[PDB]
């Protein structure tokens, strides 16, 4: 739904506005889980190739973990940009059409009469 | 005694003086004297030792008091912050009322056991206090359900006041 927005560069992974966003912390649970998935992928690959599960293919396991963390970091930055621009468009549209989003006045619990349903 | 007679009232004991008509010795008096000399003296000695050890290592603790947060009646609906504060205050007052009912019931039981054969006459004020606090408790807390809350208590009070006002019309 956000592909037709104004200023949308076509097939652009990380546009320059994403540079305004704070980057992922590089030690955060999403990237740590991505590295864990890469290590699990290496272990499962060893077990399916009938190698020793952990002490075989250390370079392969390192490459799996590194590639998973790298791809996860850049994809996470892209998704952070997408959610940020979604909230930016939502807030801008709300500010542009305030008559369709009126500030409703919530009364206190002294003028409203909630019906009482006795449990007995 | 950590308790006080203002909240646990007790009439003063009226024991009669012994008037032994018989010349036989009283085995109860003999056994109470022997029991004192054998049991009560070492027990009070070790208790005095424990009390002086506590006096050597004396510490204090306090009773926590909560300020009155604004009631749920001035809390706007959908404002979960003040609603949470009022709900926690209401649960606190609910627990205090439970213990108040426990105090009143314990007082009534003490009256009944003290009077014995005269409980139908001499526990009139205790039974009246129990009845009044039971009626107030039923007016504020009864039939709320398992998910009792300040909102449900307020709705019940509003319904009861509406019924009373409609009855007061005629
Ligand atoms: C040894 C292994 C770990 C080595 C760690 C080495 C790196 C390190 O020290 O990192 C410190 C780093 C410091 O954290 P931080 O940046 O200070 O922020 C921590 C806060 O608590 C902020 O963290 P948070 O609580 O905001 O979490 C972020 C958020 C986003 O994070 C995630 O989504 C990660 C979830 C990991 C699990 O988490 C969630 O939303 C949790 C979702 C939970 C429901 C998931 C339902 C699916 C099933 C269970 C999970 C899947 C397991 C495998 C499948 C089998 C299921 C039975 O700690 C972490 O990264 C924490 C997670 C580490 C363990 C991951 C799981 C194993
Ligand atoms: C630990 C849990 C995860 C293990 C994953 C790897 C699995 C594996 O390869 O296991 C084999 C291997 C053990 O094999 P082995 O005994 O040494 O020798 C191989 C056999 O000779 C091979 O014998 P074989 O091939 O001749 O015949 C055996 C064959 C015979 O086949 C069978 O017996 C068939 C069995 C069929 C029934 C089971 C169906 C599958 C059930 C899956 C789970 C479902 C329920 C769980 C909840 C829902 C999950 C979606 O397979 C088995 O008996 C089972 C093989 C797989 C077992 C491990 C399964 C792991 C996944 C499920 C549990 C964990 C996730 C769920 C729970 C999450 C928390 C709630 O497992 C490990 O070594 C586990 C890892 C232990 C070290 C962990 C160190 C962590 C270090 C962290 C820091 C460094 C990285 C930092 C990264 C981040 C940097 C930023
Ligand atoms: C290896 C992968 C390397 C990827 C390099 C960058 C590719 C690229 O240009 O991605 C942009 C692409 C389309 O972006 P957009 O203009 O929003 O198009 C809407 C189409 N759904 O963006 C996307 O398609 C976003 C989703 C990508 C998912 C990739 C993993 C699955």
UniProtKB/Swiss-Prot annotation, chain A:
Signal sequence annotation:
none
Kindly indicate whether the keyword Magnesium belongs to this entry. no
Keyword Electron transport: yes or no? yes
Topology class, membrane? Single-pass membrane protein
Q: Which UniProt keywords apply?
A: Electron transport, Membrane, Mitochondrion, Mitochondrion inner membrane, Respiratory chain, Transmembrane, Transmembrane helix, Transport
**Domain of life from the UniProt record:** Eukaryota
Query: Looking at the UniProt record for this protein, which Gene Ontology cellular component terms does it annotate, in alphabetical order?
Result: mitochondrial inner membrane; mitochondrion; respiratory chain complex I
Q: Report the locations given in the UniProt record.
A: Mitochondrion inner membrane
Which GO BP terms sit in this record?
aerobic respiration; mitochondrial electron transport, NADH to ubiquinone; mitochondrial respiratory chain complex I assembly; negative regulation of non-canonical NF-kappaB signal transduction; negative regulation of reactive oxygen species biosynthetic process; positive regulation of ATP biosynthetic process; positive regulation of mitochondrial membrane potential; proton motive force-driven mitochondrial ATP synthesis
Which InterPro entries has this protein been placed in?
Answer: NDUC2
Grouped into one coarse class, the protein's main location is mitochondrion
> Any stretches that span the bilayer, and where are they?
57-76
Tell me the protein family, please.
Belongs to the complex I NDUFC2 subunit family.
What does the subunit section of this Swiss-Prot or TrEMBL entry state? Complex I is composed of 45 different subunits. Interacts with TMEM242.
Function, as annotated, reads: Accessory subunit of the mitochondrial membrane respiratory chain NADH dehydrogenase (Complex I), that is believed not to be involved in catalysis but required for the complex assembly. Complex I functions in the transfer of electrons from NADH to the respiratory chain. The immediate electron acceptor for the enzyme is believed to be ubiquinone.
Which protein are we looking at?
A: NADH dehydrogenase [ubiquinone] 1 subunit C2
Query: Source species, please?
Result: Mus musculus
Swiss-Prot record, chain B:
Region Disordered: start-end pairs: 1-25
Phosphoserine: modified positions: 19, 149
Show the ranges annotated as biased composition (Basic and acidic residues): 1-8
Compositionally skewed regions (Pro residues) per UniProt: 9-19
Location comes to:
Mitochondrion inner membrane
- Tell me which Gene Ontology terms the entry assigns under biological process: aerobic respiration; proton motive force-driven mitochondrial ATP synthesis
Q: How does it sit in the membrane?
A: Peripheral membrane protein
Q: Which InterPro entries match?
A: NADH_UbQ_OxRdtase_su10, NDUFB10
Going by the UniProt record, its keywords in alphabetical order are: Electron transport, Membrane, Mitochondrion, Mitochondrion inner membrane, Phosphoprotein, Respiratory chain, Transport
Record-level GO cellular component terms: mitochondrial inner membrane; mitochondrion; respiratory chain complex I
Identify the main location. mitochondrion
User: Mind telling me which Pfam families this protein's record contains?
Assistant: NDUFB10 (PF10249)
Superkingdom in the source lineage: Eukaryota
The family line of this record is: Belongs to the complex I NDUFB10 subunit family.
Q: What does this protein do?
A: Accessory subunit that is involved in the functional assembly of the mitochondrial respiratory chain complex I. Complex I has an NADH dehydrogenase activity with ubiquinone as an immediate electron acceptor and mediates the transfer of electrons from NADH to the respiratory chain. Accessory subunit of the mitochondrial membrane respiratory chain NADH dehydrogenase (Complex I), that is believed not to be involved in catalysis. Complex I functions in the transfer of electrons from NADH to the respiratory chain. The immediate electron acceptor for the enzyme is believed to be ubiquinone.
What is annotated about its quaternary structure and interactions?
Complex I is composed of 45 different subunits. Interacts with CHCHD4.
Name of the protein this chain belongs to: NADH dehydrogenase [ubiquinone] 1 beta subcomplex subunit 10
Q: Which organism is it from?
A: Mus musculus
Gene name on record?
Ndufb10
